[PDB]
Design a protein around this ligand. Structure first.
Ligand SMILES: [Mg+2]
Ligand SMILES: [Mg+2]
Ligand SMILES: [Mg+2]
Ligand SMILES: [Mg+2]
Ligand SMILES: [Mg+2]
Ligand SMILES: [Mg+2]
Ligand SMILES: [Mg+2]
Ligand SMILES: [Mg+2]
Ligand SMILES: [Mg+2]
Ligand SMILES: [Mg+2]
Ligand SMILES: [Mg+2]
Lengths: 63, 50, 107, 62, 31, 50
RNA sequence: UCUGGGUCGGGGUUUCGUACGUAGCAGAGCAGCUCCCUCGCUGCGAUCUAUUGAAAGUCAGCCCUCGACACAAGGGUUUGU
RNA sequence: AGAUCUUGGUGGUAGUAGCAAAUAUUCAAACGAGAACUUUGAAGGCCGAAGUGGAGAAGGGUUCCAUGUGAACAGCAGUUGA
Protein backbone atom coordinates (compact mmCIF):
# COMPACT_ATOMS: atom_id res chain seq x y z
CA UNK A 1 0.00 0.00 0.00
CA UNK A 2 0.93 3.68 0.33
CA UNK A 3 2.28 5.02 3.62
CA UNK A 4 2.73 8.67 2.64
CA UNK A 5 0.36 9.80 5.39
CA UNK A 6 1.86 7.54 8.06
CA UNK A 7 5.47 8.59 7.46
CA UNK A 8 4.54 12.28 7.59
CA UNK A 9 2.65 11.72 10.84
CA UNK A 10 5.50 9.62 12.23
CA UNK A 11 7.94 12.43 11.45
CA UNK A 12 5.65 14.90 13.21
CA UNK A 13 5.27 12.73 16.32
CA UNK A 14 8.95 11.79 16.51
CA UNK A 15 9.89 15.48 16.03
CA UNK A 16 12.44 14.49 13.38
CA UNK A 17 12.56 14.63 9.61
CA UNK A 18 11.21 12.00 7.27
CA UNK A 19 14.77 10.85 6.58
CA UNK A 20 15.14 9.38 10.07
CA UNK A 21 11.75 7.62 10.01
CA UNK A 22 11.94 3.85 9.51
CA UNK A 23 8.80 1.84 8.78
CA UNK A 24 8.90 -1.95 9.08
CA UNK A 25 8.60 -3.28 5.52
CA UNK A 26 7.45 -6.66 6.83
CA UNK A 27 4.43 -5.35 8.74
CA UNK A 28 3.19 -3.04 5.99
CA UNK A 29 -0.41 -4.21 6.41
CA UNK A 30 -0.52 -3.37 10.12
CA UNK A 31 0.84 0.15 9.61
CA UNK A 32 -1.63 0.88 6.80
CA UNK A 33 -4.48 0.57 9.31
CA UNK A 34 -2.95 3.36 11.41
CA UNK A 35 -4.65 6.60 10.38
CA UNK A 36 -4.34 8.75 13.53
CA UNK A 37 -1.49 10.14 15.60
CA UNK A 38 -2.75 8.07 18.53
CA UNK A 39 -2.20 4.86 16.57
CA UNK A 40 1.24 6.08 15.49
CA UNK A 41 2.18 6.53 19.14
CA UNK A 42 1.20 2.91 19.72
CA UNK A 43 3.28 1.71 16.76
CA UNK A 44 6.33 3.75 17.78
CA UNK A 45 6.20 2.29 21.28
CA UNK A 46 5.52 -1.19 19.86
CA UNK A 47 8.69 -0.94 17.76
CA UNK A 48 7.18 -1.10 14.28
CA UNK A 49 8.30 2.51 13.73
CA UNK A 50 11.89 3.33 14.68
CA UNK A 51 13.77 6.63 14.68
CA UNK A 52 17.04 6.10 12.85
CA UNK A 53 20.21 7.57 14.38
CA UNK A 54 21.84 10.70 13.01
CA UNK A 55 24.40 10.01 10.29
CA UNK A 56 27.91 9.95 11.74
CA UNK A 57 29.99 13.06 11.01
CA UNK A 58 33.13 12.58 13.08
CA UNK A 59 35.34 15.52 13.99
CA UNK A 60 38.25 13.27 14.97
CA UNK A 61 40.04 14.09 11.72
CA UNK A 62 39.69 17.78 12.53
CA UNK A 63 40.98 17.27 16.07
CA UNK B 1 53.80 -5.37 -39.42
CA UNK B 2 57.37 -5.21 -38.14
CA UNK B 3 60.75 -3.82 -39.17
CA UNK B 4 63.99 -5.32 -40.44
CA UNK B 5 67.64 -4.36 -40.89
CA UNK B 6 69.49 -4.87 -44.16
CA UNK B 7 72.37 -3.69 -46.31
CA UNK B 8 71.94 -1.59 -49.45
CA UNK B 9 73.29 -2.47 -52.90
CA UNK B 10 72.53 0.86 -54.58
CA UNK B 11 75.62 2.62 -55.97
CA UNK B 12 75.52 6.39 -56.07
CA UNK B 13 73.29 6.58 -53.00
CA UNK B 14 74.02 7.91 -49.51
CA UNK B 15 72.96 4.54 -48.04
CA UNK B 16 75.19 2.33 -50.20
CA UNK B 17 77.00 -0.33 -48.14
CA UNK B 18 75.14 0.95 -45.06
CA UNK B 19 72.67 -0.65 -42.68
CA UNK B 20 69.09 0.60 -43.02
CA UNK B 21 65.80 -0.31 -41.40
CA UNK B 22 62.64 -0.95 -43.37
CA UNK B 23 59.02 -1.59 -42.49
CA UNK B 24 57.69 -4.96 -43.62
CA UNK B 25 54.24 -6.55 -43.58
CA UNK B 26 53.83 -10.24 -42.75
CA UNK B 27 51.35 -12.21 -44.86
CA UNK B 28 50.79 -15.78 -43.73
CA UNK B 29 50.32 -17.94 -46.84
CA UNK B 30 49.34 -21.55 -46.19
CA UNK B 31 49.55 -23.73 -49.32
CA UNK B 32 46.40 -23.62 -51.43
CA UNK B 33 44.38 -26.57 -52.71
CA UNK B 34 43.15 -26.67 -56.31
CA UNK B 35 39.69 -28.20 -56.64
CA UNK B 36 38.68 -27.38 -60.20
CA UNK B 37 39.41 -25.86 -63.58
CA UNK B 38 37.37 -23.35 -65.60
CA UNK B 39 37.98 -22.66 -69.28
CA UNK B 40 37.26 -19.28 -70.81
CA UNK B 41 36.45 -18.68 -74.47
CA UNK B 42 36.85 -15.36 -76.28
CA UNK B 43 33.78 -13.74 -77.86
CA UNK B 44 33.19 -10.40 -79.60
CA UNK B 45 31.51 -9.55 -76.26
CA UNK B 46 34.44 -10.59 -74.05
CA UNK B 47 35.67 -13.66 -72.24
CA UNK B 48 32.94 -16.04 -71.14
CA UNK B 49 33.02 -19.18 -69.00
CA UNK B 50 32.90 -22.12 -71.39
CA UNK C 1 19.51 -31.55 -12.64
CA UNK C 2 17.19 -28.54 -12.47
CA UNK C 3 17.55 -27.49 -8.81
CA UNK C 4 21.31 -27.48 -8.16
CA UNK C 5 23.17 -24.29 -7.25
CA UNK C 6 26.65 -23.26 -8.32
CA UNK C 7 29.35 -20.70 -7.56
CA UNK C 8 30.85 -18.50 -10.28
CA UNK C 9 33.14 -15.51 -10.64
CA UNK C 10 32.51 -12.71 -13.13
CA UNK C 11 34.96 -10.36 -14.84
CA UNK C 12 32.90 -7.23 -14.34
CA UNK C 13 35.83 -5.19 -15.62
CA UNK C 14 35.72 -7.11 -18.90
CA UNK C 15 31.96 -6.79 -19.29
CA UNK C 16 31.94 -3.05 -18.42
CA UNK C 17 34.94 -2.07 -20.54
CA UNK C 18 33.75 0.95 -22.54
CA UNK C 19 30.69 2.00 -20.54
CA UNK C 20 30.35 5.62 -19.48
CA UNK C 21 30.72 6.84 -15.93
CA UNK C 22 27.05 7.31 -15.06
CA UNK C 23 25.94 3.91 -16.37
CA UNK C 24 28.71 1.56 -15.22
CA UNK C 25 26.97 0.11 -12.17
CA UNK C 26 23.49 -0.29 -13.76
CA UNK C 27 25.13 -1.80 -16.83
CA UNK C 28 27.00 -4.14 -14.50
CA UNK C 29 23.73 -5.26 -12.94
CA UNK C 30 22.17 -5.74 -16.37
CA UNK C 31 25.15 -7.84 -17.47
CA UNK C 32 24.93 -9.89 -14.27
CA UNK C 33 21.27 -10.54 -15.05
CA UNK C 34 22.17 -11.56 -18.61
CA UNK C 35 24.94 -13.81 -17.28
CA UNK C 36 22.47 -15.43 -14.88
CA UNK C 37 20.12 -15.99 -17.81
CA UNK C 38 22.95 -17.52 -19.89
CA UNK C 39 24.13 -20.30 -17.58
CA UNK C 40 20.66 -21.11 -16.23
CA UNK C 41 18.13 -20.66 -19.02
CA UNK C 42 15.72 -18.99 -16.59
CA UNK C 43 14.46 -15.54 -17.64
CA UNK C 44 13.42 -14.92 -14.02
CA UNK C 45 16.43 -13.60 -12.08
CA UNK C 46 16.44 -12.17 -8.55
CA UNK C 47 19.47 -10.12 -7.52
CA UNK C 48 20.07 -10.10 -3.77
CA UNK C 49 20.29 -6.82 -1.87
CA UNK C 50 23.71 -7.77 -0.49
CA UNK C 51 24.95 -8.39 -4.02
CA UNK C 52 23.56 -5.03 -5.11
CA UNK C 53 25.37 -3.40 -2.18
CA UNK C 54 28.59 -5.16 -3.18
CA UNK C 55 28.20 -3.90 -6.74
CA UNK C 56 27.54 -0.33 -5.61
CA UNK C 57 30.10 -0.48 -2.79
CA UNK C 58 32.64 1.74 -4.56
CA UNK C 59 30.19 4.22 -6.03
CA UNK C 60 28.76 4.44 -9.53
CA UNK C 61 31.87 4.58 -11.76
CA UNK C 62 34.46 2.52 -9.86
CA UNK C 63 32.65 -0.82 -10.01
CA UNK C 64 34.82 -3.71 -8.71
CA UNK C 65 36.72 -5.49 -11.46
CA UNK C 66 35.58 -8.99 -10.49
CA UNK C 67 32.82 -10.44 -8.34
CA UNK C 68 32.15 -13.84 -6.78
CA UNK C 69 28.49 -14.82 -7.11
CA UNK C 70 26.38 -17.88 -6.32
CA UNK C 71 23.56 -18.86 -8.67
CA UNK C 72 20.69 -20.93 -7.27
CA UNK C 73 18.11 -22.31 -9.70
CA UNK C 74 15.10 -22.78 -7.42
CA UNK C 75 11.52 -23.73 -8.17
CA UNK C 76 9.23 -20.81 -9.02
CA UNK C 77 6.29 -22.99 -7.93
CA UNK C 78 4.93 -20.54 -5.38
CA UNK C 79 2.27 -18.95 -7.62
CA UNK C 80 0.86 -19.17 -11.15
CA UNK C 81 4.08 -18.26 -12.94
CA UNK C 82 4.90 -18.64 -16.65
CA UNK C 83 8.30 -20.10 -15.70
CA UNK C 84 8.67 -22.85 -13.12
CA UNK C 85 12.34 -22.10 -12.35
CA UNK C 86 13.88 -18.85 -11.13
CA UNK C 87 17.55 -18.03 -10.58
CA UNK C 88 18.43 -16.27 -7.32
CA UNK C 89 21.93 -14.80 -7.28
CA UNK C 90 23.82 -14.09 -4.06
CA UNK C 91 27.21 -12.56 -3.27
CA UNK C 92 30.03 -14.65 -1.79
CA UNK C 93 32.74 -12.45 -0.21
CA UNK C 94 36.25 -13.61 -1.10
CA UNK C 95 39.70 -12.28 -0.32
CA UNK C 96 41.39 -13.17 -3.61
CA UNK C 97 40.50 -14.30 -7.12
CA UNK C 98 43.59 -16.38 -7.95
CA UNK C 99 42.93 -19.97 -9.08
CA UNK C 100 39.19 -19.68 -8.43
CA UNK C 101 37.21 -22.27 -10.39
CA UNK C 102 33.50 -22.71 -10.98
CA UNK C 103 32.34 -25.32 -8.47
CA UNK C 104 29.12 -27.30 -8.13
CA UNK C 105 28.04 -26.57 -4.55
CA UNK C 106 25.51 -28.81 -2.82
CA UNK C 107 22.27 -27.56 -1.29
CA UNK D 1 72.95 -6.49 -35.60
CA UNK D 2 74.08 -2.87 -35.69
CA UNK D 3 76.12 -1.17 -32.99
CA UNK D 4 73.85 -1.60 -29.98
CA UNK D 5 73.59 1.31 -27.57
CA UNK D 6 72.39 1.73 -24.00
CA UNK D 7 69.79 4.08 -22.57
CA UNK D 8 69.24 6.20 -19.49
CA UNK D 9 67.84 3.07 -17.87
CA UNK D 10 70.85 1.09 -19.09
CA UNK D 11 68.62 -1.15 -21.19
CA UNK D 12 69.79 -2.38 -24.58
CA UNK D 13 68.34 -0.39 -27.48
CA UNK D 14 67.69 -2.38 -30.65
CA UNK D 15 67.79 -0.68 -34.07
CA UNK D 16 64.53 0.92 -35.07
CA UNK D 17 63.58 1.62 -31.45
CA UNK D 18 63.58 4.74 -29.35
CA UNK D 19 65.08 8.15 -30.00
CA UNK D 20 68.49 9.82 -29.97
CA UNK D 21 69.11 13.18 -28.31
CA UNK D 22 72.07 15.48 -28.97
CA UNK D 23 72.55 18.48 -26.70
CA UNK D 24 74.19 21.84 -27.38
CA UNK D 25 77.35 20.95 -25.44
CA UNK D 26 77.94 17.97 -27.75
CA UNK D 27 76.92 15.05 -25.54
CA UNK D 28 74.67 12.53 -27.31
CA UNK D 29 72.08 10.48 -25.43
CA UNK D 30 69.64 7.82 -26.58
CA UNK D 31 66.45 6.58 -24.97
CA UNK D 32 64.45 3.39 -25.32
CA UNK D 33 61.08 5.15 -25.09
CA UNK D 34 59.52 8.43 -24.01
CA UNK D 35 59.41 7.32 -20.37
CA UNK D 36 63.20 7.32 -20.06
CA UNK D 37 63.42 10.61 -21.98
CA UNK D 38 60.81 12.21 -19.72
CA UNK D 39 62.74 10.97 -16.70
CA UNK D 40 66.00 12.35 -18.09
CA UNK D 41 64.59 15.73 -19.14
CA UNK D 42 63.02 16.09 -15.68
CA UNK D 43 66.48 15.63 -14.10
CA UNK D 44 65.72 12.50 -12.09
CA UNK D 45 68.61 10.44 -10.78
CA UNK D 46 68.57 6.90 -12.22
CA UNK D 47 69.93 5.54 -8.94
CA UNK D 48 66.59 6.25 -7.21
CA UNK D 49 64.25 4.67 -9.79
CA UNK D 50 63.62 1.04 -8.89
CA UNK D 51 63.34 -0.41 -12.39
CA UNK D 52 66.53 1.28 -13.62
CA UNK D 53 69.42 -1.14 -14.17
CA UNK D 54 71.83 1.23 -12.41
CA UNK D 55 69.56 1.00 -9.37
CA UNK D 56 69.63 -2.79 -9.59
CA UNK D 57 73.42 -2.90 -9.43
CA UNK D 58 73.59 -0.10 -6.85
CA UNK D 59 71.47 -2.17 -4.47
CA UNK D 60 73.02 -5.39 -5.87
CA UNK D 61 69.64 -6.82 -6.81
CA UNK D 62 69.83 -10.23 -8.46
CA UNK E 1 13.90 -20.13 26.98
CA UNK E 2 15.90 -18.97 23.95
CA UNK E 3 17.59 -21.74 21.98
CA UNK E 4 19.95 -21.86 19.01
CA UNK E 5 17.29 -21.95 16.28
CA UNK E 6 15.43 -19.03 17.86
CA UNK E 7 18.68 -17.07 17.99
CA UNK E 8 19.38 -18.10 14.38
CA UNK E 9 16.10 -16.59 13.21
CA UNK E 10 16.71 -13.60 15.50
CA UNK E 11 19.92 -13.20 13.49
CA UNK E 12 17.73 -12.73 10.42
CA UNK E 13 15.22 -10.35 11.98
CA UNK E 14 17.62 -8.21 14.03
CA UNK E 15 19.46 -6.75 11.02
CA UNK E 16 17.65 -3.81 9.39
CA UNK E 17 20.38 -2.58 7.06
CA UNK E 18 24.04 -2.69 6.14
CA UNK E 19 27.18 -2.16 8.16
CA UNK E 20 27.08 1.00 10.26
CA UNK E 21 23.31 0.99 10.79
CA UNK E 22 21.66 0.56 14.17
CA UNK E 23 20.17 -2.69 15.44
CA UNK E 24 16.47 -3.18 16.11
CA UNK E 25 15.60 -3.07 19.82
CA UNK E 26 12.12 -4.61 20.01
CA UNK E 27 9.25 -5.98 17.94
CA UNK E 28 6.10 -6.67 19.98
CA UNK E 29 2.55 -7.14 18.70
CA UNK E 30 -0.33 -6.05 20.94
CA UNK E 31 -4.03 -5.40 20.41
CA UNK F 1 60.83 -4.96 -64.04
CA UNK F 2 64.07 -3.39 -65.27
CA UNK F 3 64.70 -0.44 -62.94
CA UNK F 4 67.47 -0.66 -60.37
CA UNK F 5 64.93 -0.54 -57.54
CA UNK F 6 63.47 -3.73 -58.97
CA UNK F 7 65.54 -6.89 -59.59
CA UNK F 8 67.67 -5.81 -56.61
CA UNK F 9 69.01 -8.52 -54.33
CA UNK F 10 67.60 -8.30 -50.81
CA UNK F 11 69.48 -9.87 -47.89
CA UNK F 12 68.32 -9.41 -44.31
CA UNK F 13 70.77 -8.80 -41.49
CA UNK F 14 68.26 -8.72 -38.63
CA UNK F 15 64.52 -9.14 -38.10
CA UNK F 16 62.81 -7.47 -35.17
CA UNK F 17 60.74 -9.85 -33.04
CA UNK F 18 60.10 -7.70 -29.96
CA UNK F 19 56.77 -7.40 -28.17
CA UNK F 20 54.41 -5.44 -30.41
CA UNK F 21 51.82 -5.45 -27.61
CA UNK F 22 53.22 -2.23 -26.17
CA UNK F 23 56.88 -1.20 -26.24
CA UNK F 24 58.99 -4.33 -26.42
CA UNK F 25 62.67 -4.40 -25.55
CA UNK F 26 63.56 -8.11 -25.85
CA UNK F 27 63.67 -10.42 -28.83
CA UNK F 28 63.44 -13.91 -27.30
CA UNK F 29 62.26 -15.60 -24.13
CA UNK F 30 65.79 -16.77 -23.38
CA UNK F 31 67.21 -13.27 -23.84
CA UNK F 32 64.61 -11.75 -21.52
CA UNK F 33 65.12 -14.47 -18.89
CA UNK F 34 68.90 -14.13 -19.05
CA UNK F 35 68.72 -10.36 -18.66
CA UNK F 36 66.15 -10.28 -15.86
CA UNK F 37 67.37 -13.31 -13.91
CA UNK F 38 65.01 -15.39 -11.79
CA UNK F 39 61.67 -13.94 -10.73
CA UNK F 40 59.24 -14.47 -7.86
CA UNK F 41 56.83 -16.56 -9.95
CA UNK F 42 59.55 -18.98 -11.05
CA UNK F 43 61.00 -19.04 -7.53
CA UNK F 44 57.68 -20.10 -6.03
CA UNK F 45 57.08 -22.47 -8.96
CA UNK F 46 60.31 -24.30 -8.14
CA UNK F 47 59.45 -24.00 -4.43
CA UNK F 48 56.24 -25.99 -5.00
CA UNK F 49 57.73 -28.33 -7.62
CA UNK F 50 60.92 -29.26 -5.71
C1' U G 1 33.17 -33.66 -36.01
C1' C G 2 38.64 -36.71 -35.71
C1' U G 3 33.38 -33.13 -30.82
C1' G G 4 32.46 -27.48 -31.01
C1' G G 5 31.93 -22.78 -28.83
C1' G G 6 31.73 -20.26 -24.42
C1' U G 7 32.57 -18.72 -18.72
C1' C G 8 36.29 -18.88 -15.21
C1' G G 9 41.56 -20.40 -13.95
C1' G G 10 46.79 -20.56 -15.66
C1' G G 11 50.90 -19.03 -18.60
C1' G G 12 52.94 -15.35 -22.22
C1' U G 13 52.92 -10.36 -23.47
C1' U G 14 52.80 -5.47 -21.79
C1' U G 15 51.55 -0.88 -18.44
C1' C G 16 52.75 1.38 -13.88
C1' G G 17 56.64 1.20 -10.48
C1' U G 18 58.43 -2.14 -5.14
C1' A G 19 51.77 -3.33 -2.47
C1' C G 20 49.34 -4.60 3.09
C1' G G 21 51.52 -6.82 7.16
C1' U G 22 55.79 -8.07 9.42
C1' A G 23 60.96 -7.17 10.91
C1' G G 24 65.14 -3.28 11.38
C1' C G 25 71.54 -1.82 16.83
C1' A G 26 67.75 3.02 10.01
C1' G G 27 65.48 7.33 11.03
C1' A G 28 65.13 14.68 12.59
C1' G G 29 64.11 13.86 17.30
C1' C G 30 60.57 14.20 21.46
C1' A G 31 58.10 12.37 25.96
C1' G G 32 58.06 8.70 29.86
C1' C G 33 61.14 4.16 32.82
C1' U G 34 66.61 4.38 36.23
C1' C G 35 67.82 -0.29 43.04
C1' C G 36 67.25 -0.89 37.52
C1' C G 37 70.67 0.46 33.50
C1' U G 38 77.02 1.12 33.34
C1' C G 39 75.27 2.00 28.32
C1' G G 40 70.87 1.45 28.87
C1' C G 41 64.45 0.27 27.99
C1' U G 42 59.12 1.78 26.67
C1' G G 43 55.74 4.85 23.52
C1' C G 44 54.87 9.01 19.55
C1' G G 45 57.77 9.33 14.85
C1' A G 46 57.12 11.50 8.04
C1' U G 47 60.63 8.76 5.68
C1' C G 48 64.58 4.64 4.38
C1' U G 49 66.01 -1.10 3.79
C1' A G 50 64.73 -6.63 3.48
C1' U G 51 60.27 -9.15 2.56
C1' U G 52 59.70 -7.11 -3.41
C1' G G 53 61.64 -5.67 -10.79
C1' A G 54 57.18 -6.34 -5.82
C1' A G 55 51.40 -5.40 -5.82
C1' A G 56 47.45 -4.48 -9.55
C1' G G 57 45.21 -4.41 -14.55
C1' U G 58 45.81 -6.94 -18.94
C1' C G 59 40.53 -7.80 -24.52
C1' A G 60 36.14 -6.38 -23.42
C1' G G 61 38.43 -5.76 -30.84
C1' C G 62 46.10 -9.31 -27.76
C1' C G 63 48.22 -14.77 -27.91
C1' C G 64 48.47 -20.21 -26.21
C1' U G 65 45.50 -23.37 -23.01
C1' C G 66 43.38 -28.91 -23.28
C1' G G 67 42.87 -27.23 -16.13
C1' A G 68 37.62 -26.90 -14.05
C1' C G 69 32.42 -25.83 -15.11
C1' A G 70 28.07 -26.14 -17.56
C1' C G 71 25.99 -25.68 -22.50
C1' A G 72 25.43 -27.05 -27.49
C1' A G 73 21.42 -31.99 -33.92
C1' G G 74 17.35 -26.63 -30.76
C1' G G 75 13.63 -22.60 -32.05
C1' G G 76 10.23 -19.52 -35.81
C1' U G 77 9.08 -17.60 -41.46
C1' U G 78 9.19 -18.92 -46.51
C1' U G 79 10.87 -20.70 -51.23
C1' G G 80 9.04 -25.64 -57.23
C1' U G 81 11.08 -25.97 -63.34
C1' A H 1 -12.72 29.52 -58.42
C1' G H 2 -10.46 33.14 -57.65
C1' A H 3 -10.45 38.71 -54.19
C1' U H 4 -2.70 37.35 -49.10
C1' C H 5 -11.73 36.74 -49.76
C1' U H 6 -15.18 35.49 -44.24
C1' U H 7 -16.57 31.03 -41.38
C1' G H 8 -16.20 25.78 -40.64
C1' G H 9 -13.96 21.11 -41.84
C1' U H 10 -10.02 17.84 -43.94
C1' G H 11 -5.09 16.53 -46.24
C1' G H 12 0.42 16.20 -48.17
C1' U H 13 4.19 17.41 -45.07
C1' A H 14 4.36 12.88 -41.15
C1' G H 15 4.29 8.82 -37.45
C1' U H 16 8.57 13.82 -39.40
C1' A H 17 11.32 17.93 -35.92
C1' G H 18 11.27 16.52 -31.55
C1' C H 19 9.95 14.79 -26.33
C1' A H 20 18.70 16.96 -25.11
C1' A H 21 19.73 23.63 -19.61
C1' A H 22 20.89 22.62 -14.08
C1' U H 23 25.97 14.95 -12.78
C1' A H 24 21.98 9.61 -11.27
C1' U H 25 20.11 6.27 -10.30
C1' U H 26 19.83 0.91 -8.49
C1' C H 27 18.08 -3.82 -5.90
C1' A H 28 14.21 -6.54 -3.28
C1' A H 29 9.29 -6.51 -1.54
C1' A H 30 3.88 -4.87 -1.02
C1' C H 31 -1.00 -3.47 -3.22
C1' G H 32 -2.29 -4.02 -8.07
C1' A H 33 -4.69 -7.25 -13.94
C1' G H 34 -0.81 -4.14 -15.32
C1' A H 35 5.39 -1.14 -12.25
C1' A H 36 10.64 2.93 -14.44
C1' C H 37 7.82 6.73 -12.77
C1' U H 38 2.82 4.60 -6.33
C1' U H 39 4.65 3.00 -1.52
C1' U H 40 8.39 0.48 2.19
C1' G H 41 13.36 -1.02 3.19
C1' A H 42 18.64 -1.20 1.45
C1' A H 43 22.66 1.03 -1.51
C1' G H 44 24.76 5.20 -4.26
C1' G H 45 24.15 10.40 -5.19
C1' C H 46 22.66 15.80 -5.13
C1' C H 47 20.81 20.57 -2.83
C1' G H 48 25.76 22.03 1.04
C1' A H 49 22.64 26.87 6.01
C1' A H 50 23.21 33.52 0.33
C1' G H 51 19.93 25.33 0.30
C1' U H 52 16.18 21.88 -3.91
C1' G H 53 15.87 23.57 4.22
C1' G H 54 12.20 25.99 7.89
C1' A H 55 8.72 30.30 7.91
C1' G H 56 6.18 35.15 6.07
C1' A H 57 4.29 39.74 2.96
C1' A H 58 1.90 40.56 -2.15
C1' G H 59 -0.96 37.54 -4.95
C1' G H 60 -4.01 32.83 -5.91
C1' G H 61 -8.94 31.38 -3.12
C1' U H 62 -10.04 25.76 -1.16
C1' U H 63 -5.20 24.32 -4.41
C1' C H 64 -5.16 22.73 2.60
C1' C H 65 -6.62 17.49 4.85
C1' A H 66 -9.07 12.63 4.62
C1' U H 67 -11.98 8.68 1.48
C1' G H 68 -13.12 6.72 -3.54
C1' U H 69 -12.48 6.90 -9.47
C1' G H 70 -9.27 5.27 -13.52
C1' A H 71 -14.09 9.09 -18.36
C1' A H 72 -10.64 13.70 -19.70
C1' C H 73 -5.41 16.41 -18.05
C1' A H 74 -0.37 15.87 -15.83
C1' G H 75 2.81 16.73 -24.20
C1' C H 76 5.14 8.56 -22.17
C1' A H 77 2.91 5.90 -18.40
C1' G H 78 0.69 5.88 -13.80
C1' U H 79 -1.88 1.68 -8.72
C1' U H 80 -0.08 8.72 -8.28
C1' G H 81 -1.32 13.83 -8.53
C1' A H 82 -2.10 21.12 -7.29
MG1 LIG I 1 52.26 -2.00 -30.13
MG1 LIG J 1 42.38 -14.45 -17.56
MG1 LIG K 1 -15.11 29.16 -54.01
MG1 LIG L 1 -13.72 34.48 -62.00
MG1 LIG M 1 -7.68 33.59 -49.52
MG1 LIG N 1 12.04 11.58 -34.14
MG1 LIG O 1 15.88 16.06 -26.36
MG1 LIG P 1 27.35 17.68 -2.14
MG1 LIG Q 1 11.78 27.71 0.97
MG1 LIG R 1 -3.43 18.09 -0.98
MG1 LIG S 1 0.17 11.59 -20.66
Amino acid sequence: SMLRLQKRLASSVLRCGKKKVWLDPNETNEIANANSRQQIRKLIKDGLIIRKPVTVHSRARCR
Amino acid sequence: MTHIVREVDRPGSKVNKKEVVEAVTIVETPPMVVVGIVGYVETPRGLRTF
Amino acid sequence: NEVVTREYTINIHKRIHGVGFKKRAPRALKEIRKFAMKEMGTPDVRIDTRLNKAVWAKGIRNVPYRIRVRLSRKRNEDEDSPNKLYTLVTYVPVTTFKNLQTVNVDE
Amino acid sequence: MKVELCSFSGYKIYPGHGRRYARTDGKVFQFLNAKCESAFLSKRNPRQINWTVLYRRKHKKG
Amino acid sequence: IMNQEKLAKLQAQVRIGGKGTARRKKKVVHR
Amino acid sequence: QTKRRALEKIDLKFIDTTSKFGHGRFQTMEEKKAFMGPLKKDRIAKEEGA
